[PDB]
Amino acid sequence: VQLQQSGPELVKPGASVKMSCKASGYTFSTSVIHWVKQKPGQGLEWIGYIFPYNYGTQYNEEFRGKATLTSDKSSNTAYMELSSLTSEDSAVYYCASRSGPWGQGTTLTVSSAKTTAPSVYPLAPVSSVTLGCLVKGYFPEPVTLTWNSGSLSSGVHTFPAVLQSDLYTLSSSVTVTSSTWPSQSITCNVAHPASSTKVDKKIEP
Amino acid sequence: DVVMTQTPLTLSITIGQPVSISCKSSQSLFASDGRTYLNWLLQRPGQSPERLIYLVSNLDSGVLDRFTGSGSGTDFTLKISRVEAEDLGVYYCWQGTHFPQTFGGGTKLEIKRADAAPTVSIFPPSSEQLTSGGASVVCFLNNFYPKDINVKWKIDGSERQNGVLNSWTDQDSKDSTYSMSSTLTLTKDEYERHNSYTCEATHKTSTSPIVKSFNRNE
Numbered sequence: 001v002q003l004q005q006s007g008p009e010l011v012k013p014g015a016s017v018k019m020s021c022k023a024s025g026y027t028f029s030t031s032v033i034h035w036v037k038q039k040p041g042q043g044l045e046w047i048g049y050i051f052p053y054n055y056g057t058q059y060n061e062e063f064r065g066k067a068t069l070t071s072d073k074s075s076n077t078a079y080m081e082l083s084s085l086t087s088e089d090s091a092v093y094y095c096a097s098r099s100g101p102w103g104q105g106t107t108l109t110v111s112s113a114k115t116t117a118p119s120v121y122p123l124a125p126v127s128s129v130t131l132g133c134l135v136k137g138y139f140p141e142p143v144t145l146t147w148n149s150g151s152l153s154s155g156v157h158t159f160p161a162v163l164q165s166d167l168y169t170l171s172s173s174v175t176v177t178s179s180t181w182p183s184q185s186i187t188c189n190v191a192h193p194a195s196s197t198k199v200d201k202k203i204e205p
Numbered sequence: 206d207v208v209m210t211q212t213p214l215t216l217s218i219t220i221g222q223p224v225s226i227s228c229k230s231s232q233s234l235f236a237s238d239g240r241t242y243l244n245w246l247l248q249r250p251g252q253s254p255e256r257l258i259y260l261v262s263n264l265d266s267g268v269l270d271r272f273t274g275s276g277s278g279t280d281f282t283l284k285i286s287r288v289e290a291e292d293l294g295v296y297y298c299w300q301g302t303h304f305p306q307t308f309g310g311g312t313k314l315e316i317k318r319a320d321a322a323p324t325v326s327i328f329p330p331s332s333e334q335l336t337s338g339g340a341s342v343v344c345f346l347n348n349f350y351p352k353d354i355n356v357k358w359k360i361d362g363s364e365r366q367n368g369v370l371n372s373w374t375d376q377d378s379k380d381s382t383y384s385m386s387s388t389l390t391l392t393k394d395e396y397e398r399h400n401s402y403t404c405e406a407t408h409k410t411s412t413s414p415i416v417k418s419f420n421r422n423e
């Protein structure tokens with residue numbers, strides 16, 4: 001059994017958002033679903049829970065007028081609606097089953113700022129040869145990074161993004177043997193959901 | 206609200222040694238129905254939490270038998286008989302006896318390995334970035350141990366602190382090492398006015414810096 005959450009969202013302040021959490025046909029219709037908030041580099045905060053059959057809920061007093069927990073029995077889906085969104089609502093939100101599973105999380109960015117497409121640059125070097133990929137100037141978070149569509153994953157270090165100043169930037173390194181590159185092809189594959197961009201950049205000597 | 210105090214704040218342990226994490230509640234977790242609602246979660250780097258233990262001592266499915274949970278009332282304990290690299294992360298206790306439900310602050314578990322030196326790599330601005338009028342110089346300091354490291358950027362014999370954007374990874378389970386990335390952002394022009402670009406790494410493993418350089422005009 002596993003819980004699949006809805007994709008990331010960027011919403012303007014004052015507006016409202018609705019997230020989904022879906023499990024297999026069994027567990028959800030009998031188990032309690034909790035909702036938890038986690039701000040980057042911080043601990044966990046319980047928002048509330050919802051009961052299966054009876055549609056009964058319980059809220060943390062801090063979220064009384066912020067969150068609203070609902071469930072669709074027919075589709076095995078629990079929802080969380082957050083209202084009058086503030087920068088303080090920018091965080092990762094998880095759903096957690098009383099019977100064990102947790103969702104992957106849904107990232108929420110509360111910002112006035114505009115959706116920017118990322119600039120993708122191939123980092124060519126000047127036993128093993130290290131290659132790179134720079135992902136500069138994009139908004140909001142997150143982005144997805146793979147090497148050669150996925151056939152390269154072993155010797156890879158993907159780094160977290162940093163904020164400066166509108167606008168986020170992150171990098172990734174791939175260390176393969178001196179014989180592997182440039183005899184065989186190594187390409188970088190970046191994807192930003194918000195800007196609807198899918199970039200593929202070949203690392204060239 | 207029930208305050209959940211976790212001790213120690215951090216734990217650094219050698220592979221195969223025992224680990225003990227404490228969780229103390231401000232109120233008894235013994236409920237009106239005779240049950241005790243205390244859960245233990247592990248947050249792995251770049252992952253959502255996962256529950257290891259429920260109702261003081263029950264192990265979740267797939268949780269290795271080296272994990273043991275115990276306690277009663279206001280004092281709880283999570284134990285690892287002989288630690289493994291895949292056990293690293295932040296440990297959180299979760300109470301459900303009182304409302305609102307609350308979590309402990311966390312306990313960071315870092316794995317102890319033999320001190321490794323960073324593999325330094327330097328990258329000049331790509332041709333593409335230079336076309337678009339931008340200039341970023343990237344430097345990777347990969348697979349080192351311990352975590353404390355200093356990245357100094359030198360341009361033509363002088364230190365540069367402006368335009369520097371540093372980013373660290375959390376300890377990898379696969380080799381118990383830390384990695385880091387540094388970026389020096391300049392305008393194409395500032396970049397074109399300088400020639401020698403250095404990435405110095407100051408660590409414990411060597412005396413003294415691990416220097417990587419390139420000449421723009423080369």
Ligand SMILES: O=C(O)c1ccccc1-c1c2ccc(=O)cc-2oc2cc(O)ccc12
Pocket residue numbers: 032097098099242243244259260299300301302306
């Ligand atoms: O799911 C919860 O509410 C919960 C939160 C923290 C700690 C334990 C629980 C928990 C329960 C809490 C209160 C209650 O009345 C019943 C609970 O039942 C559980 C059953 C589990 O299998 C596993 C866990 C629980």
